[PDB]
Each structure stands twice: as C-alpha cells, then as structure tokens.
C-alpha cells in the first residue's frame, strides 16, 4: 500500500490496472475502496461495470453519485463508486465518526480535473485529508491510485501523493492526425461506405441539430432496419417522447447528442452508436468527457467553441474516441479549418495539455480549514500549518485570513485550541460551502418564523439551488405566470422577497444590471422562478408541459432535478444537525421526490431501481401502492399493465430486456428489498 | 454686476465690503441676495448682524440655516443668509420654478471650504449653476462675491467665476512670531496681570476640560464679580443646567468650549469671553472655524490633533483670533512644542494653506447631473458637456458614467433628450443625495405597507439620519433598553429589521466587522438606537435623562436634533413630491418637533422665536396654549410666570434682556405673528 499514480491514453485498457488493484486490496484487507469519478454518468457506468465484474465474488458495489445513494449502510458496502463531491462528504463523515481505518484504498479517475475546474479543489482536499491522516497515524493504511492523460507534471502529482509513476503513450489503434482544408458529399459517401461510424463534434446545439438533420437529408436523397425500428420504439415511449427532428434523422444512421436531450435519450443514442446501429453522431463538448464511446473517425466542426479557441484538454480527450480496440486497425481525427482558422487549428494540433493548477481568502481554503477543524484533526495553529504543506498548492499564509473569516462568521470558537460551536458542525455534515451556509442559515431561520404549509412551494424555495445559471429566464412569461398564480403561492412569494415592482421592471425594461452587491434580490426572483419549475416538477407534470409553461427544455429541467435533489438532501442534513426537527421532517420527503419528480404516494414505490416515474404511476394506478404489494403479484399481471420479445422500455445499465422479463425483475427486486 | 472675488485675513473687516455690495445691489435692482455661510452658528450670527444693520431701511433679512427657516415666503425676503446645504436647495427650487431672475447677488463667505470638504462640492455646484444660467441667458444678471484667507490659487478661482481679484495681507493688530523654548503657569500669570485674555486650543475634550480645571485651581490657590455671577445664573437656568466642573472653573476667569456642551452653553461662554468676563478660554478645533471671537494671545496645546499633524488651514484660522481691532496693539500666537514635536511645529509655522481641490462615478457628479436635468437647463447630451466646462474641476468623461447610473436607477428617462419621471423630480426638490434616495424610497415604500401608528417610533425611524457617526453606541445599555422596551416599540423594531440575535452578538462579542456590503443590517440597529434617542427627545425629557439612558452627551444629542430635523424636513418634501399624502401628513409635524424637541401641543407655541422648549412648557402649563392666546395677556403675568433687572434667561442674538422685558417682547412678537 505504497500508493500509486499513473497515466495512459484512453482506449488502451487503462482502467484494468485499477480493477486488479482494487480487487486485490478489498479481497486482502477486507476494507472499503472508493472509486472517485468526475461525472455522474461515468460514475453510474463504472458502478454497473464493477457490479457485473465483482458480483460473483461476494463484493458489494454501490456508489454515491448525483442525488442518488445506496439503499444500504456504508458498512455493508465494499466498493463505493462515488463522484468527487460526494467522496469528500464520505471522508468527512468517516473522520467525524473516527472510523477512518475502515478504508483500504481510494482510486481516482481522470485526475486532470484536479487543475482548473469548479470541482478539482474538492479532489485536492479529499486527497489531502487522506495523506494527512495517513502520515499522522500510520505501510498498508490507505492506497491511492490516479489516472490521467499525458500530464506535463505527472511526476509532481506523484511526489505530492508519495506514489510511484508510470506514463506511456500507447494505443492499439494508432491515431493519425492530419489536418486538411466541394468533395463534401464524396467524403461522406466514402466514409459511410466503408462500414465505419463517424463522430462529429459541434459546439452549437442548434447548429449541431441542423447539421445532423441535413446529413440525414443528404443520405435520404442519395438513397439493421429491425434493430433501428427497435430503437425507434424505445425512443417513442419516454416521458418526453420522441423529437420531431430526431424521428426523421434516426432512420438514416444519423443522430445527435447534446445536453438538451434527456439522460434517457442520451443513453439510447449512446447505446445505438456503440452497437453500431447509428453510423454518424453529431455530439457536443459534453460528450468529450462523457461515457466511453469509441468511434472509427472523429471530426470537429471548428476549433471555435463558445466564441474562443477550443480547450486543448477537450481536444485531447476528444481524439481518444477515434479507434476501436479489437475491431478497428487504425483511427482518424480530422479537423476541418478555414483561412482565418488555419492558424488556430495548427496551434491546436501541436502542444499537449496545460499544467495542473490548484485554485487555492478563497472559499476553498475556508472549506479546507472548516473540514480539518470540525473533523478534529487540526485544532491548534501548530498543526494547521502542516496541512498547508500537505496540499498540492504547497508541493507545487492564506490560512489566517480564512481562519478569521470563520470566527468572524461564528463558524468556530477560539480557546490556543479551536472548536466548532454548532454551525461549523452542521456545515461540514451537510457538505455545504461555508460561504453559502450563512445565507442558508438566514433563509431557513427566517422561513421557520412564518412558514407556509398550504403547498410545497415554500419548502421548494428553500431547497432551490441558484449557484449556477441553469437556464435563461424569460421574464414576460414569468410575469404572466405571476399574475396567474394562486394567492397561496403569492403569500410565500411575498415572504421570500418577490416584489411585483421588480417583475414589472424586468417584463419590459432590459434586465437590470446587478452592479451592486446589494442586488442579490435579483437572485430571489430567479430562485422563485426555479422553485415554481420544481413545484411543477414534483407535481408529476410532463416535461413538455414544464417546457411550454416555463421555456426550459427537458435537459435543463433534468439538470435542475439533480441539482435541486442534491441540494435538498444537503439542506436536510444541515437542518438535522442544527436541531431543527420540524424543518428536517418537512424537508426529508423532498429529496426523493426531486430525484424522481414524483408525488408523495410514489415515494415508497420508486425504491425499486427498475421503476421510472412513469413506471411507478402505472403500477400505482393499477393498485400496487407499495413495494411489498408489488412483490405479491404474478409476472403476467405486471406484464399486461406495462403493455397497456421486443425491447421497448429502457433502464440505466440494461440488457436484452423486454416487457416480459422486465416485469419478472420488478417483482424479484421488490422481494429482495423486503 | 461683473462678479467679484477677493481674499483678506480675518480680523481686518474683510466682510465689510460685502455689506456695502449687498446694500447697493438690493437697493438698486430690488433683487435678492443669498449670503452663504459654512456653519449654522456663523450663519445665525451673520443673520442677526445683517438684521441689525439693515432694519432701518425697511429690508427683510431671514436665512435658511440648519433645520430652521423663515416664517414668511421667499418672495418677501431680500437677503437670505443661508448655509451652503440650503442655498443649493434655494437655487434648485428657483430653477425648477423658472424664477431665476429674482436673484441679484450671491455672496459666499469662507470660500476655501470649496476644496477638500464634505460640503464644498455643494458650494461648487451652486456656483456652477449661477454661471451656467447667466451665460445661457444674459451685465447685471447675478453678482458673486467670495472671501478666504491667502489662497495659493485665488486667481484661478476668480478666472473660473469670471470675476476680479483682490488679495492683501493686512491687519490692524499685527501678529508676531518668535519661538522661545508645559511651563504655562508663569506665562498665564504675566498675561493675566496685563489685563488681557488668552485663547488656548486643545485637541482632546476631556483633557481640555481638565486643562481648564487645573488652570482654575492654580488661580484659586495662588491668586467683574457681579457680571460673573450674572453669567453663573444664566448658566444655572438651562435645560441641561450647569456642569460640576464648569461651576468651579468659571469664577476664576477660566472656561472651556467644545462640541460636548450645548449650543446655549457655547453661546454663554463665547459672549462672556468676548465681553472680557472670561480671561482664559480652552476651546477646541470646533471654535477655530466658529464665530468671530478675537483674543489677545492665542496658544495651542500641541500640533498633534487626532493622532496626526494639525491641519495648516485650521492653524491659519486659529491665529487670526490673536488680536482685537480697536483695543489691542499687537497680537501674539505661541505654539508650545517638544523634542519630537519640534520638527512638526517648525513645519507648521511655515507654509500657507494647500490648494483648493474640486472633489468631483462620484456621487457629486450624479447630484449635479440630476440637478441640471430635472431643472430643464441641460436636457440633451450636447449641452451637458458645457456644464463640465463650467465646473471648477474643469477650469482647474465621468458624465456618461453618472448619466447611466441615473437611468440604471430609473432617476431619469431617455428620449437624445433626458427627463425625470417621478423619483428624479422628488429627489431634487427634496435636496436628498441621489445615492441614498434609493434606500429612502425602499424604506418609505416598505413602511407604508405595515405602518405602526401606536407611537411615533416608526415615524422617527424613517426620519432618522445615519450618514455620520453622531455618537458611539454602547450595545450593553442598548440591549438593556431592548429588554425593557414595550411590545408596541418592538413590533416596529421587527418591522424595520432589528433582530435579537444581532444585539446578542454585540452585547458580549466584539463589534462585528462590516467587511461585506451586505452588512448594512448593522446600520439598521444603529438607526433604531438613534430613533429611540429621538423619541425620548421629542417626548420632552431632559437632556441629562437621555444622556444617562443612552450615554450620548447633550452636545451630541443637539447635533442629532438638528440633523434629524433637517432630514425629517427633506423626507417630508420627498414624500410630498412623490404623491404620498398620508406619509407626508404623518411626517409634517415631526420637523418642528425635532427642531425644538417638543410635543405636538407646543408646536403652535414655539412659533415665537423668543420661546424655547422650556419657555414653551411653562407658558403651556399656565394656560397659554396658542400664540394668539399668548398675545392676549398682560406683561406682568408672563413676567411672574417666567420668574416662577438681572439678565438670567438667554436667547440667540440677545441684548440687555431680563425677566421683565423678555416677557414684553414675547407678547409683542406674538402680536406681530398674528
Ligand atoms: C450530506 O450531503 C448530501 C446529502 N444528500 C445528497 Cl443526495 C447529496 C449530498 C452531497 C452534496 N454535495 C456534495 C456532497 C454530498 C455528500 O457528501 N453526500 C453523502 N452521501 N453519503 C454520505 C455518507 C453519508 C454516509 C456515511 C455514513 C456512515 C459512514 C461510516 N462509517 C460513512 C459514510 S455523504
Ligand atoms: C427640502 O429640503 C429641506 C427641507 N427642510 C429642511 Cl429643515 C432642510 C432641507 C434641506 C436639507 N439639506 C439641504 C438643503 C435643504 C433645503 O433645500 N432647504 C430649503 N428650505 N426652503 C427652501 C426654499 C425651498 C423654497 C423656495 C425657494 C424659492 C422660492 C421662490 N421664488 C420659493 C420657495 S430650500
């Protein structure tokens, strides 16, 4: 357990070494092993992969990613395939419970995210806690394994982690980069005729869709079917349904992939392309760091991405998806350029990725100091300075400025030992940023004074996150909804801070500039709009209805789903620890309702992993109002309900599943839950 | 009327030419003459001087200074001896009423205040408006006159104003300067033996009082009585009474003068020193720019003033008070120094005053743009650039940044042509700073939603100014008062924003740092404390009771009186112009109540200038519940009531007035009011 850090290009079986190491460590030490992943989609896919590969050895595999969580305690688990943000909370609770020795290893995937990123600092703190605790309390304590592409400072990361080094540039499908700048239809025909797929990357969502549409149009003009019809039917029966453009585009071996779609539609398209059913796929920058989806020929619409040169890291991870290891011999990554874009393309062709930064007065150092002090691992000044040396910023005097910020905001109490009073303890357990915890504390305390129980809107407003701009708000439609709102919802609107004057300013006048820090009251109205969307969401209204009523597309609504559910869980833990029992009770149900977008009655029924929001309503309408009830039922009954050999349903990480055996597994999983 | 600018040292009749100029202009053109003064005390003194000197020519002389105002329209007036703040409002209302030609002269006193100062910018804008309006609409339009000490750039100011120049350093009592190295006992003894006064200047207040006390003690130990006893009795019968230290210090020809005293006590001491009854006077930096109070020998405790070298302009105006024109031969100024202070003293001995700045993104330019736009004198962009050239900053591109700031805050509406909608018109007529008018608008609009009429506290909170730190707040006593507050007062406290949590933080914990702009909620609690003080003030409780209950001394309470009354008047005009009739009605009575610190019943009775807060209660208790009633009464009745040849009462600008003839003037003035 001397730790380890290694890098290798993707599409080269580079995760296999991690699988072997984790198997060895869990089987030998009988201790846990966190598998940290950047994104929730890749975390889900890796969790399914590890479940399949380690089911036959009595190894439990269930991670903490997104808003979801395992239905069993952390003790029973053996491998937790968590995301970066939730792995930090896992380690924090282990430290606070003084059960740190339960961990045997911590694998980290795609370590290049350590640098410039809005989540890498969480990875930095997460690994710093491990190194600090290992060195304070000791050969075979906690192994760390990392992955990345060709990092200019990989050896530096290994030195920080006190781990070995392995860097190699090898792939079974040698890529051939060749820039080139009529013959468009000829190129399309010659690439498609070879029986090989094409993965095109386009920055703009609308232009990506139109490009896929016109590729399908050219194929239709110049012009397996059963499996493609199966994919048609699978797309048809979805909560959002089938898109008009996608319907015409899919049956000519052309598809598109962007955040605008739902997670389920993205899964359908990814599976269709991976199986080879889809030949041409116009994806966007989102897929670049997404699930493993190799192709034969990669193409890029243009270096320009969002009014700027494309990130070199994005290009590096894009090229990895050009070549299939096992069926393909060679792979290509073509990059069209223009006269003015020739220089940008040439610059992008050469040069590896930029160095890894740290991103640490900054809120990250406040979070770090809070973690260490509340955890009880750095209580006095003498040792908190060693934590600075433990970090990657050091290995590559702001602590005092942060420590005072915490005492200024009463997060901790000085004694010269330090301790948390109540808000620091509740802030670390909730995994909330200490910067926003003061605002959350004020909003919760204000809410409990005059809480509105007539509807869920006041509860939703308090579990509505607004740390990112999840969508652009149309203030005219928002004013229409406001004037159409019931009075019960308007009482909470007045309570929170919404004013008809501000909406009147925004409906006609240009969006008011928030030049001054005092204009956080612009965030109040955006928060109220988002909370109304979330109320329509948990009311179980179709995504299309929420789209027309509010203008946010289904992909944005699903991202809001996940963010709101995660925030609701965090706020529930915050309230639980703060001693606010009534607030905790009112908030508890909302995490699951937000995760699944379901009513209170379906909450006891979505405990079965194989039950969507629609598949929970159909069973509830039939009479299965509880998982125990759903266990006591024959397979043919559920089969006929689902209907009212062909794979038509879809579930995350599915197999040759149809309406027949899907009903068989629904009842079987219900039995296991009981 | 070719304007004029001149400078000359004080104690040389520099103001004399002003009186002749005003007399000539007012008698010839029959137009008005605004005499602008820096401070309210000097404005009062000059108003009384001009009244005495021009009563025998049938000319009205009543100025707008402090919270007070004439009891007759501006039309009937001939000379308005206003202060800088209120002269700007006079000019603004003249411009808005398009009656600018009514003015014939604008004399300005102590023009060096135009530079670095928290009020000089108002003088700058006031003078800029006159020159702009004269040049757009024409050589007898409006004459301008100025005064100051030896300004390094007097010619520059004259060039800005397009006026002549006269600068001379002459004084009938030549001041000497020859350093000869506390050692004040013999110096004071030899000076007092010569039958000459001494004016000592001390930076600190408590140490100034102790310095007066020790000098009185040495005079008592080592070393007219009827007039000094008269001054004793005059000090005895005051709302604040007589200080313990002042009682023991006054009868040995020693007194002290600082902002801690009341305006009345300051007036008593100044009169006693001017008459020669007081020989030694320990004043502070406040008196340096105060009323004319010449002395034979000036002394300064130390160049260090407030932890820094004494301002050179302050020293220049101090030394002017060393020499009496007509009874003195040669005046002296002695500046004691030390080993470390020798360098500072020699530095301060040499070098005249610094050059005059302009102090013009800045709120001053926002105010200027607002004034010119709603005045209708600068509507289109083309001419607003000329205003910039008209300024003293120019004569010695931020307009666009300010113009957008006004449109950003909806102060004006764009059309090529700019106009005010409602808030700009109400802001300029209210003479409020447009920076704070947004907060005032928010607080007023919020108040009308949930107004509390049970007591005056909610009305006082809205007319409580907090633009300066009028006193240091003791949060322990404030918490005690909060505990003892009635529920009616606590409802308004909750409405405004006061929270028991913040007071709990402040009572024991150190004063919370307002590092963040979002912590204006510290100003809410200071505002509430000040409003409670103001409520006790208008409840007609003695100043000593307010001092013990709140800790603010009587001088601070009187400064708060004046500031709160001025702010109440401004807010009343703001509400009047905004169309808020109920708010205006509730606010109207409060300006006079704050000015005099009286109840509603005495408001109709303090219309007589001779009547004070105490002298209005004694008559009201007798039965004179109205000025008309007070007119219908014999002189002996009021004489006996006042009692229940010796000058015992005091009133601003008094004469050989006693209890007998004071009653005679009270009834006589009441008749004139009717
Ligand atoms: C408490 O914050 C959350 C609550 N809800 C959700 Cl949906 C998401 C979050 C969240 C949001 N943003 C960042 C991080 C988190 C997060 O940290 N989430 C966690 N999920 N599971 C955790 C461990 C609690 C379990 C535990 C119990 C015993 C032992 C032992 N021995 C070890 C671990 S923490
Ligand atoms: C409206 O602001 C105030 C109200 N209350 C008070 Cl106690 C003080 C103020 C104040 C505070 N800080 C700065 C300036 C002011 C201020 O502007 N004070 C004034 N008070 N009266 C004035 C003349 C307005 C009237 C007028 C002028 C010309 C003609 C003609 N022809 C007719 C009427 S201006």
CA angle B187/B192/B194 to nearest 5° reads: 105
Closest CA to B650 of B339, B232, B255: B232
**Cβ–ligand 1 contact at A85 (below 6 Å):** yes
Is-contact A616 A638, C-beta < 8 A?
A: no
Q: Return the SS3 of A299.
A: strand
Tell me the two tokens of residue A139: 């050969």
| Alpha helices (H) in A204-298, listed in sequence order | 205-222, 225-236, 244-249, 263-275, 285-288
Tell me the two tokens of residue A457: 């809107």
Q: Are residues B408 and A516, on separate chains, in Cβ contact within 8 Å? A: no
d(CA A372, CA A392): 16
Is-contact B632 B572, C-beta < 8 A?
A: no
Element (H, E) at A633: none
The alpha carbon of residue A449 is apart from the nearest alpha carbon of chain B, in Å, by 12
Tell me the two tokens of residue B541: 């409780």
Nearest CA to ligand 2 atom 32: B74
Query: Which residues 6+ apart lie within 8 Å of A619 measured at CB?
Result: A605, A611, A630, A638, A641
Elucidation technique: cryo-EM
- HSE-up of A200 (CA within 13 Å, CB side)? 23
CA angle A597/A603/A607 to nearest 5° reads: 105
Q: What is the largest CA-CA distance in chain A?
A: 80
Query: Which residues 6+ apart lie within 8 Å of A100 measured at CB?
Result: A94, A133, A137
Closest CA to A148 of A107, A106, A113, A122: A113
Q: Using only the alpha carbons of chain B, give its radius of gyration.
A: 26
* Whole-number Cα distances in Å, A256 to A201, A279, A621: 10, 11, 35
d(CA B113, CA B101): 27
Is-contact A542 A523, C-beta < 8 A?
A: no
Which ligand is in closest contact with the Cα of A428? Answer: 1
Residues in chain B closer than 8 A to A517 (CB atoms)? 516-518
* Strand order through the sheet with B331-335: B175-176, B331-335, B297-300, B198-201, B280-283, B254-256
Tell me the two tokens of residue B354: 């610094």
Element (H, E) at A156: helix A154-161
Query: Which residues 6+ apart lie within 8 Å of B593 measured at CB?
Result: B538, B599, B600, B603
* Whole-number Cα distances in Å, A406 to A96, A361, A414, A430, B500: 19, 11, 10, 17, 22
Q: Return the SS3 of A3.
A: coil
**Region of B164 on the Ramachandran plot (φ > 0 left; ψ -120 to 50 alpha; else beta):** beta
Q: Does B416 touch chain A (CB under 8 A)?
A: no
Q: Are residues A408 and B516, on separate chains, in Cβ contact within 8 Å? A: no
Kindly report the number of other CB atoms within 10 A of residue A651's CB atom. Answer: 16
Map tokens 């009682």 to a residue: B247
Residue in B408, B505, B518 nearest the CB of A518 = B518
Strands (E) across A560-603 are located at none
Residue in B408, B410, B517 nearest the CB of A518 = B517
User: Which residues of chain B from 461 to 490 reach within 8 Å of chain A, CB to CB?
Assistant: none
Is-contact A506 A512, C-beta < 8 A?
A: yes
Looking at residue A68, the DSSP 8-state letter turns out to be -
The alpha carbon of residue B415 is apart from the nearest alpha carbon of chain A, in Å, by 14
Is-contact B92 B429, C-beta < 8 A?
A: yes
Residues in chain B closer than 8 A to A518 (CB atoms)? 517-518, 520
Ligand 2 geometric centre to CA of B87 (Å): 8
Burial of B217 (0-12, 13-18, 19+ CB in 10 A): middle
Closest CA to A229 of A250, A246, A213, A259: A250
Pair type for strands B175-176 and B166-167 = unpaired
Cα dihedral B258/B260/B262/B264 (nearest 10): -20
Element (H, E) at B498: none
Query: Which residues 6+ apart lie within 8 Å of A472 measured at CB?
Result: none
Looking at residue B518, the DSSP 8-state letter turns out to be G
Closest CA to B328 of B300, B292, B299, B295: B295
d(CA A482, CA A500): 9
DSSP character string of B335-359:
E---TTHHHHHHHHHS--PPPP---
d(CA B115, CA B153): 11
d(CA A358, CA A242): 43
Map tokens 């007798």 to a residue: B622
Task: Provide the annotated binding site of B.
Answer: 8-15
Is-contact A340 A305, C-beta < 8 A?
A: no
**Cβ–ligand 1 contact at A66 (below 6 Å):** no
Closest CA to A10 of A317, A310, A289, A274: A317
Question: To one decimal place, what's the resolution in Å?
Answer: 2.7
d(CA B557, CA B543): 8
Size of interface A-B (CB pairs under 8 A): 16
Q: Return the SS3 of A517.
A: helix
Tell me the two tokens of residue B83: 């202060």
Residues in chain A closer than 8 A to B505 (CB atoms)? 410
Closest CA to A538 of A555, A567, A553, A560: A560
Burial profile B242-269: b = 16 or more Cβ within 10 angstroms, e = fewer: bbeebeebbebbbbbbbbbbbbbbbbbb
Q: Does A513 touch chain B (CB under 8 A)?
A: yes
Query: Which residues 6+ apart lie within 8 Å of A55 measured at CB?
Result: A61
d(CA A455, CA A432): 26
Is-contact B9 B171, C-beta < 8 A?
A: yes
Burial of B655 (0-12, 13-18, 19+ CB in 10 A): exposed
**Region of B323 on the Ramachandran plot (φ > 0 left; ψ -120 to 50 alpha; else beta):** left
Is-contact A208 A202, C-beta < 8 A?
A: yes
Is-contact A34 A90, C-beta < 8 A?
A: yes
Is-contact A245 A213, C-beta < 8 A?
A: yes
Closest CA to B394 of B67, B132, B73, B660: B132
Looking at residue B32, the DSSP 8-state letter turns out to be E
* Whole-number Cα distances in Å, B516 to B100, B154, B521, B599: 45, 42, 11, 40
Classify the C-alpha dihedral B229-B230-B236-B242 as positive or negative: negative
Ligand 1 geometric centre to CA of A38 (Å): 16
User: A581-596 and A434-449 are packed helices; what angle lies between their axes, rounded to 10 degrees?
Assistant: 110
* Whole-number Cα distances in Å, B575 to A271, A518, B456, B462: 68, 24, 17, 11
Map tokens 């090529």 to a residue: B416
Query: Which residues 6+ apart lie within 8 Å of B43 measured at CB?
Result: B37, B63, B65, B66, B81, B82, B83
d(CA B182, CA B200): 13
d(CA B367, CA B405): 11
Closest CA to A171 of A35, A320, A361: A320
Residue A117, Cα to own-chain centre: how many angstroms? 14
Q: Are residues B518 and A516, on separate chains, in Cβ contact within 8 Å? A: no
Burial profile A547-579: b = 16 or more Cβ within 10 angstroms, e = fewer: beebbbbbbbbbbbbbbbbbbbbbbbbbbbbbe
Ligand 2 geometric centre to CA of B37 (Å): 15
Ligand 2 geometric centre to CA of B90 (Å): 6
| Alpha helices (H) in A356-396, listed in sequence order | 363-375, 381-390, 392-395
Bridge partners, B298 (sequence order): B199, B333
d(CA A58, CA B601): 91
**Cβ–ligand 2 contact at B328 (below 6 Å):** no
Map tokens 């108003």 to a residue: B47
d(CA A499, CA B345): 60
Query: Which residues 6+ apart lie within 8 Å of A158 measured at CB?
Result: A5, A164, A165
Closest CA to A279 of A364, A347, A212, A182: A212
Kindly report the number of other CB atoms within 10 A of residue A632's CB atom. Answer: 12
CA angle B171/B177/B179 to nearest 5° reads: 170
d(CA B69, CA B570): 13
Is-contact A217 A209, C-beta < 8 A?
A: no
Give percent helix, percent strand, percent coil of chain B, each to the nearest 5. Answer: 55, 10, 35
Is-contact A312 A348, C-beta < 8 A?
A: yes
Tell me the two tokens of residue B532: 């409670």
Ligand 2 atom with least separation from CA of B102: 31
Task: Provide the annotated binding site of A for ATP.
Answer: 8-15
Write B388-393 long-range contacts (CB < 8 A, 24+): B390/B128, B390/B131, B390/B132, B390/B135, B391/B124, B391/B128, B391/B358, B391/B360, B392/B114, B392/B124, B392/B127, B392/B128, B392/B157, B392/B160, B392/B356, B392/B358, B392/B360, B393/B124, B393/B358, B393/B360
Looking at residue B303, the DSSP 8-state letter turns out to be S
Bridge partners, A417 (sequence order): A380
d(CA A436, CA A427): 10
Burial of B395 (0-12, 13-18, 19+ CB in 10 A): middle
Element (H, E) at A80: strand A79-80
Looking at residue B454, the DSSP 8-state letter turns out to be S
d(CA B606, CA B626): 9
d(CA A646, CA A659): 7
**Cβ–ligand 2 contact at B566 (below 6 Å):** yes
Element (H, E) at A480: helix A475-483
Cα dihedral B25/B29/B30/B31 (nearest 10): -80
d(CA A347, CA A334): 15
**Region of A154 on the Ramachandran plot (φ > 0 left; ψ -120 to 50 alpha; else beta):** alpha
Tell me the two tokens of residue B531: 């409003």
Query: Which residues 6+ apart lie within 8 Å of B466 measured at CB?
Result: B523, B526, B527, B530
Element (H, E) at B74: none
Closest CA to B45 of B324, B273, B290: B290
Chain A residue with minimum CA distance to B438: A518
d(CA B262, CA B240): 8
Tell me the two tokens of residue A286: 């989102």
d(CA A350, CA B529): 68
DSSP character string of B80-132:
E--BHHHHHHHHHHHHHTT-GGGEEEEEES-GGGGSSSSSHHHHHHHHHHHHH
Map tokens 């579990």 to a residue: A463
Q: Which residue, among A516, A521, A523, A524, would best test binding to B if mutated, counting the most B CBs under 10 Å from its CB? A: A516
Element (H, E) at B474: none
Closest CA to B377 of B108, B603, B144, B94: B94
Tell me the two tokens of residue B573: 């005009």
Burial profile B170-188: b = 16 or more Cβ within 10 angstroms, e = fewer: ebebebeeeeeeeebeeeb
Q: End-to-end alpha-carbon separation of chain B, Å?
A: 39
Number of residues in chain B: 674
């Amino acid at each position: 357990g001397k730790n380890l850090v290694y890098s290798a290009p993707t599409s080269a079986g580079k995760t296999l070494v991690a699988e072997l190491l984790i198997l060895k460590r869990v089987l030998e030490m009988r201790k846990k092993a966190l598998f940290i992943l950047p994104f929730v989609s890749v975390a889900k896919e890796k969790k399914y992969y590890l479940q399949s590969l380690f089911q036959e050895v009595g190894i439990k595999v269930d991670g903490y990613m997104g808003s979801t969580s395992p239905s069993r305690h952390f003790s029973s688990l053996d491998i937790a395939v968590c995301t970066i943000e939730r792995a930090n909370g896992l380690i924090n609770r282990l430290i606070e419970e003084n059960k740190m020795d339960l961990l045997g290893m911590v694998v980290v995937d795609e370590l290049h995210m350590l640098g410039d990123s809005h989540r890498g600092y969480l990875l930095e703190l997460l690994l710093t806690k491990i190194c600090y605790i290992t060195r304070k309390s000791a050969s075979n304590a906690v192994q760390i394994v990392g992955m990345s592409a060709t990092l200019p400072n990989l050896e530096l990361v290994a030195s920080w982690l006190n781990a070995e080094l392995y860097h190699t540039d090898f792939r079974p499908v040698p890529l051939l980069e060749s820039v080139k700048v009529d013959h468009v239809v000829s190129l399309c025909y010659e690439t498609i005729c070879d029986n090989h797929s094409v993965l095109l990357f386009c920055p703009s969502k609308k232009w990506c869709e139109k490009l896929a549409d016109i590729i399908a149009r050219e194929f239709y003009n110049l012009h397996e079917q059963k499996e493609l019809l199966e994919v048609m039917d699978q797309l048809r029966r979805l909560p959002s349904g089938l898109d008009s453009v996608l319907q015409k585009t899919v049956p000519w071996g052309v598809a598109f992939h962007h955040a605008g779609l739902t997670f389920e539609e993205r899964d359908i398209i990814e599976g269709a392309f991976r199986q080879g059913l889809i030949r041409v796929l116009a994806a966007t920058s989102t897929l670049s760091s997404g699930v493993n989806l190799p192709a034969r020929r990669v193409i890029i619409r243009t270096p320009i991405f969002g009014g700027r040169p494309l990130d070199i890291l994005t290009y590096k991870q894009m090229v990895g998806r050009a070549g299939r290891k096992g069926v393909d011999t060679v792979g290509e990554s073509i990059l069209i350029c223009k006269n003015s874009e020739k220089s940008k393309g040439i610059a992008l062709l050469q040069g590896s990725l930029k160095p890894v930064r740290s991103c640490l007065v900054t809120g990250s150092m406040i979070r770090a100091i809070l973690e260490i002090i509340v955890g009880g691992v750095a209580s006095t000044s003498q040792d908190m300075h060693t934590y600075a040396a433990c970090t990657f910023l050091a290995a590559s005097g702001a602590i005092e400025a942060c420590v005072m910020w915490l005492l200024e905001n009463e997060f901790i109490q000085s004694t010269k030992v330090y301790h948390p009073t109540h808000l620091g303890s509740a802030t670390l357990s909730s995994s909330l940023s200490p910067a926003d915890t003061l605002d959350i504390f004020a909003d919760l305390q204000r809410a409990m004074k005059g809480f509105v129980l007539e509807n869920d809107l006041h509860i939703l407003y308090l579990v509505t996150p607004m740390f990112e701009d999840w969508t652009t708000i149309d203030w005219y439609r928002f004013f229409c909804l406001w004037e159409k709102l019931p009075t019960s919802m308007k009482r909470v609107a007045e309570l929170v801070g919404v004013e008809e004057g501000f909406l009147a300013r925004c409906v006609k006048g240009k969006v008011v500039a928030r030049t001054e820090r005092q204009h956080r009251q612009m965030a109040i109205h955006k928060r109220f709009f988002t909370s109304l969307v979330l109320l329509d969401l948990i009311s179980e209204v179709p995504l299309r209805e929420i789209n027309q009523k509010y203008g946010c597309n289904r992909g944005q609504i699903q991202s809001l789903q996940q963010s709101a559910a995660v925030y609701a869980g965090m706020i529930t833990v915050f309230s639980n620890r703060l001693g606010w029992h009534n607030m905790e009770l009112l908030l508890s149900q909302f995490q699951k309702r937000l995760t699944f977008g379901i009513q209170r009655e379906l909450c006891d029924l979505v405990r079965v992993s194989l039950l969507n929001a629609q598949r929970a309503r159909v069973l509830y309408a039939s009479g299965f109002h509880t998982v125990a009830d759903l266990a006591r039922a024959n397979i043919v009954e559920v089969e006929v309900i689902l209907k009212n050999n062909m794979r038509t349903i879809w579930v995350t990480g599915r197999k040759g599943l149809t309406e027949r055996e899907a009903a068989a597994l629904i009842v079987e999983e219900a039995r296991m839950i009981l």
